[PDB]
Design an enzyme around this catalytic site. Structure first.
Site, PDB file in Angstrom:
ATOM      1  N   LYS B  65       0.297  -1.856   0.281  1.00 49.33           N
ATOM      2  CA  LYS B  65       0.550   0.037   0.241  1.00 49.33           C
ATOM      3  C   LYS B  65       0.867   1.554   0.249  1.00 49.33           C
ATOM      4  CE  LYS B  65      -3.817  -1.944   1.169  1.00 49.33           C
ATOM      5  NZ  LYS B  65      -3.714  -3.467   1.051  1.00 49.33           N
ATOM      6  N   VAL B  66       1.625   1.364  -1.063  1.00 50.49           N
ATOM      7  CA  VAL B  66       3.121   2.205  -0.297  1.00 50.49           C
ATOM      8  C   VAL B  66       1.850   4.046  -0.783  1.00 50.49           C
ATOM      9  CG1 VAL B  66       4.858   2.814  -1.988  1.00 50.49           C
ATOM     10  CG2 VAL B  66       4.336   0.058  -1.365  1.00 50.49           C
TER      11      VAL B  66
END
Ligand SMILES: O=c1cnn([C@@H]2O[C@H](COP(=O)(O)O)[C@@H](O)[C@H]2O)c(=O)[nH]1
Ligand SMILES: O=c1cnn([C@@H]2O[C@H](COP(=O)(O)O)[C@@H](O)[C@H]2O)c(=O)[nH]1
Ligand SMILES: [Cl-]
Ligand SMILES: [Cl-]
Ligand SMILES: [Cl-]
Ligand SMILES: [Cl-]
Ligand SMILES: [Mg+2]
Ligand SMILES: [Mg+2]
EC number: 4.1.1.23
Lengths: 220, 219
Positions: B65-66
């Site tokens: 979930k950068v």
């Protein structure tokens, strides 16, 4: 009723090598008692790096993990992070109230703290995050969030965030130095500034930290 | 285009190495693609990715979930691909520069970025949903070819498919536990992501087998 951050200065330790991260943190230890550890270091060296920092330095640890998943996964991330010894964790607000509440619930259970990231400091934050930020902040207040992160690079936005959360809330702010935010101006609104590259890439990190502190001496 | 066996990606979010390896082993005949996220990585270390490849040979999608600034995103992607991930999931909400940072590292290391446009949980309605079509168009503008969208809202998933086109690759979580239907989701997604319905089942192998049976006409 807030963490007592020495010199209003938090080190963003984003070096990815254990030896370098330890050396630099040790060198600035007399100036800083609060270290923000993120995924660049954790994914390179393991969650035990939090343990090692605790053991080596007398420093609180803020895990900058920008938690941004569904509630069920957020819970697990917070549990693992607090288990490892982090005092606090940084969580994104944009995924919504349930995702934030999942983190708050774990923090309450485990006796630790959530920092809610409202607006971000980089240019891309203008595309989607900025337009939601005041509402994300208001949501945080409604959820009982006490600790917040907002951008030094946009003084007008940081000032507004401070208004929304009130004087009693705790606000820390990155984007100082490398991204162009000014330490003194930022501390008009933030309780503490977050500084990474300006310190950790300096030929003499201690001198860099000491220099930042001298520039804000009358605010301490 | 990634070739996912049985159009089924296992979300391995168990937090114990022994259980994670055992359960993945039990369903290995059904999958060749595993999504590993922070629950497992923060509990057992990034070395678990190489261990999965050693044991199963599976593809590994790092669901991280950068969502940081470009400079930090670069470092996260570098550390993740160094650990042997084939692909990484990136939020689009923090904007184009943050996505481009990830695309650059992926190109350098021969990997793929998956752009997450709308999430599956109820809170996604507050802020993400209203930005999602624009995030998807941003993906197209940036040359993104791999996307993630929500099983729990097939009309939204269909709209995402419309925006990105038939050539783009689309994977979709929220199946099972969060209420999404496997067959309906595969009308629009290339592959479904399934975690708890498999890994918390009394019999994970039978759970996976059952899901596949329900979509056998789509394989
Ligand atoms: O809106 C944000 C939120 N977090 N950070 C984080 O704060 C640190 C800033 O470091 P720098 O002083 O080297 O720019 C980095 O760890 C970065 O991921 C930001 O820069 N901006
Ligand atoms: O919009 C999203 C994006 N990612 N995930 C991830 O996909 C998996 C879903 O697993 P589940 O089948 O157990 O719900 C979990 O790892 C979760 O973090 C979602 O559920 N929804
Ligand atoms: Cl959930
Ligand atoms: Cl941008
Ligand atoms: Cl940057
Ligand atoms: Cl919600
Ligand atoms: Mg090359
Ligand atoms: Mg069917």
């Amino acid at each position: 009723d807030v963490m007592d951050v020495m010199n209003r200065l938090i080190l963003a330790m984003d070096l990815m090598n254990r030896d370098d991260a330890l050396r630099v943190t040790g060198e600035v230890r007399e100036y800083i008692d609060t270290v923000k550890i993120g995924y660049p270091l954790v994914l390179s060296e393991g969650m035990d790096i939090i343990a090692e920092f605790r053991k080596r330095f007398g420093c609180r640890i803020i895990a900058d993990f920008k938690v941004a998943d569904i509630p069920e996964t957020n819970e697990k991330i917070c549990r693992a992070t607090f288990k490892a010894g982090a005092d606090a964790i940084i969580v994104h607000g944009f995924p919504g109230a349930d995702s934030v509440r999942a983190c708050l619930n774990v923090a309450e259970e485990m006796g630790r703290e959530v920092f809610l990231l409202t607006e971000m400091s980089h240019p891309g934050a203008e595309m989607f995050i900025q337009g939601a930020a005041d509402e994300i902040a208001r949501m945080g207040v409604d959820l009982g969030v006490k600790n917040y992160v907002g951008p030094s690079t946009r003084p007008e936005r940081l000032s507004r965030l401070r208004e929304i959360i009130g004087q009693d809330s705790f606000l820390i702010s990155p984007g100082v130095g490398a991204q162009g935010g000014d330490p003194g101006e930022t501390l008009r609104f933030a309780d503490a500034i977050i500084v990474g590259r300006s310190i950790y890439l300096a030929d003499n990190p201690a001198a860099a930290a000491a220099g930042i502190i001298e520039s804000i001496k009358d605010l301490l």
